[PDB]
TrEMBL record, chain B:
UniProt keyword annotations, A-Z: Acetylation, Electron transport, Membrane, Mitochondrion, Mitochondrion inner membrane, Phosphoprotein, Respiratory chain, Transport
Top-level taxon: Eukaryota
Subcellular location: Mitochondrion inner membrane
Protein name: NADH dehydrogenase [ubiquinone] 1 beta subcomplex subunit 9
GO cellular component: mitochondrial inner membrane
Complex 1 LYR protein domain mapped to chain residues: 13-71
Keyword Cell membrane set for record: no
Its biological purpose: Accessory subunit of the mitochondrial membrane respiratory chain NADH dehydrogenase (Complex I), that is believed to be not involved in catalysis. Complex I functions in the transfer of electrons from NADH to the respiratory chain. The immediate electron acceptor for the enzyme is believed to be ubiquinone.
Membrane-spanning segments: none
Gene coding for it: NDUFB9
Pfam families recorded: Complex1_LYR
UniProtKB/TrEMBL annotation, chain D:
Gene: NADH5
Family: Belongs to the complex I subunit 5 family.
Organism: Sus scrofa
Transmembrane parts of this sequence: 6-27, 39-58, 84-105
Function text: Core subunit of the mitochondrial membrane respiratory chain NADH dehydrogenase (Complex I) which catalyzes electron transfer from NADH through the respiratory chain, using ubiquinone as an electron acceptor. Essential for the catalytic activity and assembly of complex I.
Name assigned to this protein: NADH-ubiquinone oxidoreductase chain 5
Record localization: Mitochondrion inner membrane
Domain NADH-Ubiquinone oxidoreductase (complex I) chain 5 N-terminal: 68-111
UniProtKB/TrEMBL annotation, chain H:
Primary gene name: NDUFAB1
Keywords per UniProt: Electron transport, Fatty acid biosynthesis, Fatty acid metabolism, Lipid biosynthesis, Lipid metabolism, Mitochondrion, Phosphopantetheine, Phosphoprotein, Respiratory chain, Transit peptide, Transport, Ubiquinone
GO BP term, pick one: fatty acid biosynthetic process
Subcellular location: Mitochondrion
Reported function: Carrier of the growing fatty acid chain in fatty acid biosynthesis.
Organism of provenance: Sus scrofa
GO cellular component terms, semicolon-separated: mitochondrial membrane; respiratory chain complex I
Coiled-coil regions listed in the entry: none
Family: Belongs to the acyl carrier protein (ACP) family.
Claim: Lipoprotein is one of the keywords in the record: no
Principal place of residence: mitochondrion
Upper classification of the organism: Eukaryota, Metazoa, Chordata, Craniata, Vertebrata
Residues of the full protein shown: 69 to 156 of 156
Entry keyword Lipid metabolism: yes
Protein name: Acyl carrier protein
UniProtKB/TrEMBL annotation, chain J:
Keywords from the named record: Electron transport, Membrane, Mitochondrion, Mitochondrion inner membrane, Respiratory chain, Transit peptide, Transport
Localization per Swiss-Prot or TrEMBL: Mitochondrion inner membrane
Full protein name: NADH dehydrogenase [ubiquinone] 1 beta subcomplex subunit 2, mitochondrial
Span within the parent record: 38 to 104 of 105
Family: Belongs to the complex I NDUFB2 subunit family.
Membrane-protein topology: Peripheral membrane protein
Natural source organism: Sus scrofa
Function: Accessory subunit of the mitochondrial membrane respiratory chain NADH dehydrogenase (Complex I), that is believed not to be involved in catalysis. Complex I functions in the transfer of electrons from NADH to the respiratory chain. The immediate electron acceptor for the enzyme is believed to be ubiquinone.
This protein's encoding gene: NDUFB2
Keyword Hydrolase: no
Keyword hit for Cell division: no
Length: 104, 178, 128, 111, 220, 124, 175, 88, 459, 67, 62
């Protein structure tokens, strides 16, 4: 219905239909709140190629950047009390392995 | 919108419509007024180059390849006037348009306010009721036996006649009804 | 010259790119006049009731009634058991049911034999 | 009792009063938009106080005021979390809504 | 979350720079900033992300209100190709939209700056997906470009609107509301940033080129 | 960045990996190493409720800054020395981490240089 | 207050610091607090005083209902419908009381997580362990019974578990 | 508030304004009743440029089928008036 | 239970001895009074059901259903008296008599202590419903609809009769209390499989289960407005109530006999929701929506958990109110324009604003907006299904989307856009119609405040 | 404040909108300059970045490749 | 009539809410829970009059 003439004097202007005219079997699918079949500037099968290519390129590059992350030339951050052993869930009766850091 | 359409467009009408579309899309591409004015004159010239062609076939092929060029080079987002069928205000005020027959269902207390408006409305209703039969008869007179051929309607021709089928054209709600 | 536009189902062919409207014959013009006449006769029939002063109610449209009847009540009288109809019916009717049965039965068998093993992490799962 | 909870709840409570007055005479007049705008500005200036309390002492609270329903081992209650996020986002949203309602009184005048 | 945010900010920014409707441009700007909020959630900086939500509210609401004053003055027209020289015709709207554009682009000592410059700093200095970081930087440049498009097209040049000039921004409601959000967009960043406890271990040590990365990208 | 270029394009064997580091003992090249100390007790960081990532070796300056911000509340611009101190401690922590990275990188290069070249002096 | 038992709903001693001003500037929070006090907390307190004056005049009480202990489903013979009925009603009341016990423990857990702030992962371990013990017990007793549960199905579940445990202990004794 | 209701008189002054700003039309000999092709010696493309100027004037687009027939300034005035609901 | 029942019976001669112009007034007043008295069954002991006598008992499952029945009767009277104005006095009294007999049969069915009495009343409800549909139905198609409604129902319910008498021969009783206390497992044998099927299929066809649902669009569309109201609000819930009662003697067989019914109900949920998207008739759309909702209830009952039973009870009640409201809303427009086609009348919000508000609220409860009880029931069922298997979320999630889609589609098609130009007989809304909508809607909203009342026995 | 249209001319301006616009633009620029005078560190960085190649192996603890 | 808005829209609602919270909601356990207040070295408790000792004589890298 979006393809019809909007400047014509339809009996039902928003539906773009004339009284007594044959109605398409799929009118309720084409009411123009819905599926639009209007001609586009760029061809179908060209929009599809460009969209799929963009998305595939982005996914491939994100996976690549996952293999090759960015970081700074730094050492792992150090925390005082056996890496805060009692702080991160504790269990204060089992003698954690000494995590001890040295100055540099 | 107001004129009855014809069975087809002539070559001349198609050419004029393509001229207008090409100019509008060129204005969309050429934002500034001077640059658009320049390229629009170049367009008019390129259009006038084939103005006086007598071979209908070659004129048709010129029109066809011009349409192909327009389609390849059209603006994907042309300027639209706000109340035009693609505009951002196209049907904005359709929720405010109420048909006039709703006024007859008003409560008498509602019509107590506005007495003069409703007197004048009763006058209009009398006019329509007293014109209807003449309208029908005139339309039956002026119409070929095999039904009408176009959507064109005749005017009034006698002394106190009204143009047939006028009520819903004259009593449109408004275009800014509230 | 310029790259061509090829239409598809969900993006149709523009009218100005249609070779049919640039190859006109007298029979085409007579067809267009016939169509216009049909449109005109229908328009007048509608406008004569629309503008009628004495008419109160909803104008009835036989095209709308034909549409709803064809979409609901005329469908079964015009049905034939065909290879296409039968195969499509079987597929779209019982295929998904068995697909979902396989999926859910597999998942629940995994979960149950995992519970029998004492291996599921069911702590805190009082509500069910 | 500590003011922090009363003010955080009153901030949201007074916003419902112009909705309660929706069926009232004020709605049919041309004074309703100004009334809603004024209500929102008062809500903003009121929500400014719990923000000060948090910015001073870091006060946070949760309020489970009404018990709605309980399903065997699960209890559902009307509860409000009044941490840093709530007390910082409420005045910002009220400020922006106040500005946009004052703007609407002009932009939407002929609606 | 980081990857989803990175693609979203770059894509929306890319769509924005060719739009002709002013509301569409600002909406794509909003989508891009939401993508930035998602990338800063992805690098485990929730508090930083929240700060941006508060900062962005001010100047993005102001940008929309400025666009609205323009639209109403120009008889409900939204296409920037029919908006000419308003830098002089609408002086207060111009001032406000310029200040909002400078806050959106992270101009120093502005509300946008605390929220966005810290986010770019933290995305630069974390163990993060490299593609996400690159897309974030390209989007940071795109933001400057779309903002430039609106100002150049809507406020500079010669008039391109119809000749019956109805331009009038002399209404105290409009002026007061926009001025309120303007004062917000200028000072809220500083005040809020200095009045909250620090939930983030600040990045104090970074190479100078990395430090100027947001600025370098924006100027480009 | 240059370290990423060296690791991903050059021989990654010669670059430290940020996840698995250090691989060498902390006492390998040093004769004696003083182990890093703490100024804030566990109970202090628990009573302050700092955050579990703000409980690093700089947390005493953070407690300074937080108490001083709460003390001079209306004047939110009076806690400048405390902020600078916490920032400076954090910067020194960061340069310590950078020294760890650099120290690790040299050892790997040095170890490869000595081990495979003693293989050199053993192949002939 | 004293209305609820502080042994079932405990809380730590509530240490709060003293204000130590560091500036000459006036604290707007304390002034706002005085304003709030003398505009809100005093009229409300007076209204409550009057309400409780009117309450004291007419004082009446209600009593918690006490239920005897009847024989459970284990000591009911197979088709005795009256013993079965009373045992099933008792089992249902006990199920309700157990739900409320788990509710109390969950309330403790939530209150601790909120109260302890940034230190909840270490400071609420006892609450978490208490919940774990209660949840394990409640799960053994009632999980997987399904709708249409009953004392007989709970007994069958217990007996199945007891058989499995006995057989496991027996084959552990042979080890 | 917005723009004052249009008056046929302002309309017609505006159409005449655009028409004398057109180089192919003699100002000292153009009238509200002058036919475009017949009296002023224009062709269809001139008339198309004229409708496009009129839409640029009044900020609303005119359909091609309707325009084909706006062959004098008075017809343009009548079209704009009946479209925008002006009686005086 | 006698106190509720006798007055309902009294309603019969009260309407037969009333003056010709006072039948509606009298019936409405005393129906409302009966509804008020019934309201007192909501007080429930906790551990067990209230057993008034050997013959009748009330449950927390039962109490909500009875209150909904008694409340629905006066609403049906308000909805009927408009299109029945031209009718003779005797035929109006006969119509009201049909409605009263239906209410009487329904109250007894829900409270009968044993299955044979439940079966007899559950089947007796067929006669007044059939008479209403076929005698007062507007279209020619009503006769076919009546046959479909009768035969689909009896083909399921007669095997149930055989199964019930067999069960009483082997067990000695059909009393529900004895049935519950003396329950024993069902072995896995062909005999037990067919006993399970005969115990389940009647309630399945009442729900209706997808694929056995074809009677419902016919019967619900061809019925008069009160017939449709009672068919959607209450008569569908007989299947759910009966299944919830009967599944106590079916364990542990249900563990695997439920698989095909779960598959049918989930996929057919998706199917009927999608069907609602392409529907040209407005009553047809509401009927299929009912089907989609009852599929959710079937899943909840088949998985047999306390949360699923609670969700099923809440969803049954909420659906009963919402579906009746939607049918009444459609009927007002039908009364205006005398056609059921959805695109005939458009832009009705411009002509009838308060009715548009009623439309919006009904559409919002149909898509289960929080915190309405529609969403409470749906969410509880979805959680139980998630526990049953985590993959159900995909189907459940898809259904939620399609429901929002067709609900707002109906709202937008009927209320928004521009009005059809030709139809000029759309008069203002009557006080009767507005009051009918409010009396549907206010109770639903009120129920949100006290969710436990509609939750059921498991709560 | 009554402003009427002008038809192809620059619109009528009041003194108030000009003074307010210029005041607020100047306020923004003054604020930026004040901040950069007082908090130039937040833009230019405050602590020096160390160069790892400036680091001896005595402080960094690696042996001279013979052990 | 000058200050009639601030008394019926701010003052009356805060009277009802503060009354409701002070005597009804806080009459039950764990309904209003406030995260415990931060303590710093050198702070003085209000209840016990405790003093928490200061924090270990910084290396003083001035
Ligand atoms: C949340 C706000 C709190 C406000 C506090 C006061 C609320 C009192 C309202 C009581 C219930 C409303 C009655 C519904 C029928 C409407 C009657 C009518 O015809 O109006 C004519 C009347 C006269 O106007 P008119 O000029 O003559 O023309 C009217 C035109 O027809 C057209 O005029 P219109 O276009 O203005 O339409 C009328 C209006 C009315 O239409 C409606 O749809 C209203 C009903 C809302 C949606 C209903 C289904 C959704 C499920 C939610 C269930 C919640 C119920 C809770 C218990 C409520 C007890 C009744 O429609 C709307 O405004 C849009 C509705 C969208 C609402 C979306 C909100 C979702 C949930 C929000 C929170 C819910 C839980 C609260 C607590 C949460 C945790 C703290 O108009 C009104 O008075 C407007 C109604 C006020 C809007 C209420 C919306 C929110 C209230 C929801 C329930 C209240 C909860 C209270 C608990 C405390 C919190
Ligand atoms: C459109 C909507 C209609 C309503 C839907 C009705 C659904 C009814 C379906 C009934 C569900 C299952 C029925 C019985 C459960 C298992 C069926 C059988 O196939 O399982 C195997 C049975 O083995 C073989 O399959 C034998 C059955 C095969 C013969 C039946 C014909 C099935 C063809 C499908 C016809 C469609 C029926 C519905 C008509 C509409 C299991 O192996 P086994 O452990 O050894 O047998 C268990 C029983 N024991 C313990 C007594 C021994
Ligand atoms: C109004 C003006 C009059 C002012 C005087 C009243 C002053 C305060 C009096 C309080 C009322 C008396 C009272 O406290 O009784 C408690 C009584 C019941 O006890 P509860 O624990 O809260 O819940 C029941 C289950 N245990 O509660 C009350 O009735 C009063 C407080 C109710 C608050 C208002 C309701 C707000 C929420 C509405 C429901 C919203 C939908 C559900 C959302 C679910 C979200 C999870
Ligand atoms: C509107 C459509 C609804 C259609 C519903 C149809 C299915 C109904 C369920 C099955 C119906 C018949 C079940 C019989 C009633 C139960 C009685 C019973 O349990 O007794 C069994 C007897 O079981 C049978 O004899 C049943 C055999 C089946 C005979 C009739 C076949 C009809 C078709 C069967 C398949 C259809 C059922 C499912 C279809 C659902 C609808 C699509 C065991 O007793 P004993 O004989 O003593 O055995 C042990 C001692 N030796
Ligand atoms: C950026 C947007 C894309 C733009 C691309 C568009 C490309 C356009 C290129 C040019 C198109 C042509 O030459 S199209 C070639 C068509 N040739 C003819 O029409 C010759 C015969 N002339 C007539 O029929 C009449 O004189 C008529 C000319 C109609 C006037 O009539 P009036 O005087 O009675 O109005």
């Amino acid at each position: 219905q979006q393809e019809r003439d909007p400047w014509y004097d339809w009996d039902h202007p928003d539906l773009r239909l004339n009284w007594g005219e044959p109605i398409h079997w799929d009118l309720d699918m084409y009411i123009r709140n819905r599926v639009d079949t209007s001609p586009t500037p760029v061809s179908w099968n060209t929009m599809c190629k460009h969209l799929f290519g963009f998305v595939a390129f982005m996914l491939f590059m994100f996976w690549v950047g996952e293999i090759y992350p960015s970081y700074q030339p730094v050492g792992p951050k150090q925390y005082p009390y056996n890496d805060l052993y009692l702080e991160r869930g504790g269990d204060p009766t089992k003698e954690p392995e000494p995590v001890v850091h040295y100055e540099i | 919108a107001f004129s009855a359409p014809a069975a087809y467009l002539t070559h001349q009408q198609k050419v004029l419509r393509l001229y207008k579309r090409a100019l509008r899309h060129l204005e969309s591409w050429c934002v500034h007024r001077d640059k658009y004015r320049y390229f629009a004159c170049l367009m008019r010239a390129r259009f006038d180059e084939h103005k006086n062609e007598k071979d209908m076939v070659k004129a048709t092929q010129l029109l066809r390849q011009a349409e192909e060029e327009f389609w390849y080079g059209q603006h994907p987002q042309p300027y639209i006037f706000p109340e035009s069928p693609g505009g951002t205000s196209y049907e904005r005020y359709e929720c405010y348009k109420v048909p006039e027959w709703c006024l007859d269902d008003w409560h008498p207390s509602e019509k107590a306010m506005y007495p003069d408006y409703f007197a004048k409305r009763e006058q209009w209703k009398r006019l329509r009721r007293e014109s209807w039969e003449r309208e029908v008869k005139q339309l039956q007179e002026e119409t070929p036996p095999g039904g009408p051929r176009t959507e064109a309607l005749p005017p009034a021709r006698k002394e106190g006649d009204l143009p047939p089928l006028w009520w819903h054209i004259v009593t449109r709600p408004r275009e800014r009804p509230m | 010259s310029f790259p061509k536009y090829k239409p598809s189902r969900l993006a149709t062919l523009p009218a100005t790119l249609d070779p049919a409207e640039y190859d006109i014959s007298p029979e085409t013009r007579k067809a267009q006049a016939e169509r216009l006449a049909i449109r005109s006769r229908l328009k007048r029939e509608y406008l004569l009731q629309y503008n009628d002063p004495n008419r109160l109610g909803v104008i009835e449209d036989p095209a709308l009634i034909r549409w709803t009847y064809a979409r609901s009540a005329n469908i079964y009288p015009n049905f034939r058991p065909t290879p296409k109809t039968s195969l499509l019916g079987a597929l779209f009717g019982i295929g998904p049911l068995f697909f979902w049965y396989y999926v859910f039965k597999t998942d629940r068998d995994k979960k149950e034999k995992l519970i029998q093993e004492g291996k599921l992490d069911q702590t805190f799962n009082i509500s069910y | 009792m500590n003011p922090f909870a009363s003010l955080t709840l009153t901030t949201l409570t007074i916003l419902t009063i112009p909705i309660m007055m929706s069926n009232s005479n004020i709605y049919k007049t041309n004074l309703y938009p100004n009334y809603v705008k004024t209500t929102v500005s008062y809500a903003f200036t009121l929500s400014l106080v719990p923000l000060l309390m948090f910015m001073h002492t870091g006060q946070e609270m949760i309020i489970s005021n009404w018990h709605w329903m309980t399903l065997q081992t699960v209890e559902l209650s009307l509860s409000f979390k009044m941490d840093y996020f709530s007390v910082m986002f409420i005045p910002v949203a009220l400020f922006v809504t106040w500005s946009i309602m004052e703007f609407s009184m002009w932009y939407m005048h002929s609606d | 979350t980081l990857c989803l945010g990175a693609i979203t900010t770059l894509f929306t920014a890319l769509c924005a720079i060719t739009q002709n409707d002013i509301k569409k441009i600002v909406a794509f700007s909003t989508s891009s900033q939401l993508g930035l909020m998602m990338v800063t959630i992805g690098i485990n900086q929730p508090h930083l992300a929240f700060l941006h939500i508060c900062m962005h509210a001010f100047f993005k609401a102001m940008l929309f209100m400025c666009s609205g004053s323009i639209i109403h003055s120009l008889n409900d027209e939204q296409d920037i190709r029919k908006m000419g020289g308003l830098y002089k015709a609408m002086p207060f709207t111009t001032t406000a939209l310029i200040i909002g554009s400078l806050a959106l682009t992270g101009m120093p000592y502005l509300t946008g700056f605390y929220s966005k410059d810290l986010i770019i700093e933290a995305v630069n200095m974390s163990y993060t997906n490299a593609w996400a970081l690159l897309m974030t930087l390209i989007a940071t440049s795109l933001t400057a470009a779309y903002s430039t498009r609106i100002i150049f097209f809507a406020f500079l040049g010669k008039p391109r609107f119809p000749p019956l000039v109805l331009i009038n921004e002399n209404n105290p409601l409009l002026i007061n509301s926009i001025k309120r959000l303007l004062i917000g967009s200028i000072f809220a960043g500083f005040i809020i940033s200095n009045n909250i406890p620090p939930m983030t271990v600040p990045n104090t040590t970074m190479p100078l080129y990395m430090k100027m990365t947001a600025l370098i990208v924006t100027i480009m | 960045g240059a370290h990423l270029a060296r690791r991903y394009l050059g021989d990654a064997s010669k670059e430290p990996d940020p996840l698995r580091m250090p691989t060498f003992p902390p006492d390998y090249g040093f004769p004696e190493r003083k182990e890093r100390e703490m100024v804030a007790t566990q109970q202090e960081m628990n009573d302050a409720q700092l955050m579990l990532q703000q409980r690093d070796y700089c947390a005493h300056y953070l407690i300074q800054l937080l108490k001083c911000k709460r003390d001079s509340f209306p004047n939110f611009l009076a806690c400048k020395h405390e902020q600078h101190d916490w920032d400076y401690c954090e910067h020194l922590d960061y340069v310590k981490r950078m020294k760890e990275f650099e120290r690790e990188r040299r050892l790997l290069q040095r170890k490869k240089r000595r081990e495979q070249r003693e293989a050199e002096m053993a192949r002939g | 207050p004293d209305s609820w038992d502080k042994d079932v709903y405990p809380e730590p001693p509530r240490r709060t610091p003293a204000p130590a001003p560091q500036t000459s500037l006036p604290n707007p929070v304390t002034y706002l607090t005085k304003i709030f006090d003398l505009l809100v907390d005093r009229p409300v307190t007076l209204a409550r005083e009057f309400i409780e004056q009117q309450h004291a005049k007419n004082r009446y009480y209600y009593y918690h209902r006490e239920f005897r202990r009847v024989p459970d489903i284990t000591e009911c013979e197979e088709k005795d419908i009256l013993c079965m009925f009373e045992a099933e009603m008792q089992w249902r009341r006990d199920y309700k009381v157990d739900q409320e016990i788990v509710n109390i423990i969950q309330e403790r857990l939530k209150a601790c997580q909120q109260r302890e702030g940034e230190s909840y992962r270490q400071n609420c371990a006892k609450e978490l362990e208490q919940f774990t013990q209660v949840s394990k017990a409640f799960q053994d007793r009632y999980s997987d019974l399904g709708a249409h549960y009953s004392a007989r199905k709970c007994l069958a579940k217990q007996k199945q578990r007891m058989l499995a445990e006995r057989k496991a202990a027996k084959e552990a004794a042979a080890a | 508030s917005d723009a004052p209701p249009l008056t046929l008189e302002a309309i017609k002054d505006r159409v005449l304004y655009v028409l004398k700003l057109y180089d192919k039309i003699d100002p000292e000999k153009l009238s509200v009743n002058s036919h475009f092709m017949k009296d002023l010696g224009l062709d269809s493309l001139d008339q198309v440029e004229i409708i496009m100027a009129m839409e640029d004037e009044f900020g609303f687009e005119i359909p091609d089928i309707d325009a084909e027939k706006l062959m004098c300034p008075q017809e343009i005035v009548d079209y704009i008036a009946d479209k925008k609901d002006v009686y005086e | 239970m006698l106190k509720i029942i006798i007055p309902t019976t009294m309603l019969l001669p009260m309407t037969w001895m009333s003056k010709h112009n006072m039948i509606w007034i009298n019936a409405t007043v005393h129906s409302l009074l009966i509804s008020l008295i019934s309201l007192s069954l909501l007080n429930q002991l906790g551990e067990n059901s209230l057993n008034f006598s050997l013959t009748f008992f009330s449950d927390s499952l039962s109490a909500p259903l009875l209150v909904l029945t008694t409340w629905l009767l006066p609403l049906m009277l308000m909805a009927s008296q408009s299109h029945l104005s031209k009718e003779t006095t005797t035929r109006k009294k006969l119509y009201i008599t049909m409605l009263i007999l239906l209410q009487l049969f329904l109250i007894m069915t829900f409270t009968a202590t044993e299955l044979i009495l439940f079966y007899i009343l559950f089947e007796a409800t067929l006669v007044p419903t059939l008479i209403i549909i076929t005698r007062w139905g507007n279209q020619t198609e009503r006769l076919n609809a009546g046959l479909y409604f009768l035969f689909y129902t009896l083909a399921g319910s007669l095997p149930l009769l055989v199964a019930l008498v067999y069960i009483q021969n082997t067990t000695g009783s059909l009393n529900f209390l004895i049935i519950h206390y003396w329950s024993h497992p069902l072995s896995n044998s062909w005999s037990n499989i067919f006993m399970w099927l005969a115990c389940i299929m009647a309630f399945m066809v009442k729900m209706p289960l997808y694929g056995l649902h074809l009677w419902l669009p016919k019967a619900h569309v061809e019925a008069p407005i009160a017939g449709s109201m009672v068919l959607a609000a209450v008569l569908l819930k007989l299947g759910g109530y009966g299944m919830m009662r009967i599944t106590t003697i079916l364990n542990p067989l249900t563990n695997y006999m439920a698989y095909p019914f779960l598959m049918l109900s989930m996929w057919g949920m998706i199917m009927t929701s999608s069907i609602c998207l392409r529907q040209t008739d407005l009553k047809s759309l509401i009927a299929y929506s009912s089907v989609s909702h009852m599929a959710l209830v079937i899943v909840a009952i088949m998985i047999q958990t306390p949360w699923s039973f609670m969700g099923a009870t809440a969803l049954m009640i909420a659906h009963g109110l919402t579906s009746s409201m939607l049918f009444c809303l459609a009927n007002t427009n039908y009364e205006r324009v005398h056609s059921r086609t959805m695109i005939l009348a458009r832009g009705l919000q411009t002509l009838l604003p308060l009715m548009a508000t009623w439309w919006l609220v009904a559409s919002l409860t149909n898509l289960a907006l929080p915190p309405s009880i529609n969403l409470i029931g749906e969410l509880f069922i979805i959680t139980a299904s998630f526990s049953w298997s985590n993959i159900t979320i995909i189907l459940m999630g898809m259904n939620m989307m399609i429901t929002a889609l067709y609900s707002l589609y109906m709202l937008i098609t009927t209320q928004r856009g521009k009005y059809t130009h030709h139809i000029n007989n759309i008069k203002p809304s009557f006080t009767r119609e507005n009051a009918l909508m409010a009396l549907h809607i206010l109770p639903l909203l009120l129920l949100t405040l006290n969710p436990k009342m509609i939750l059921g026995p498991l709560y | 404040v009554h402003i009427e249209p002008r038809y192809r001319q620059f619109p009528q301006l009041t003194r108030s909108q000009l003074i307010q616009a210029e005041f607020f633009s100047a306020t923004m620029w003054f604020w930026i300059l004040w901040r950069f005078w007082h908090d130039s560190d937040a833009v230019l960085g405050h602590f020096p970045y160390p160069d790892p190649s400036q680091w001896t192996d005595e402080e960094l603890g690696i042996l001279p490749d013979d052990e | 009539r000058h200050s009639i808005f601030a008394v019926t829209h701010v003052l009356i609602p805060v009277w009802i809410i503060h009354y409701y919270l002070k005597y009804h909601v806080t009459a039950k356990p764990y309904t209003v829970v406030e995260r415990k207040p931060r303590i710093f070295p050198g702070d003085t408790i209000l209840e016990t009059g405790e003093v928490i000792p200061l924090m270990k004589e910084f290396p003083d890298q001035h």
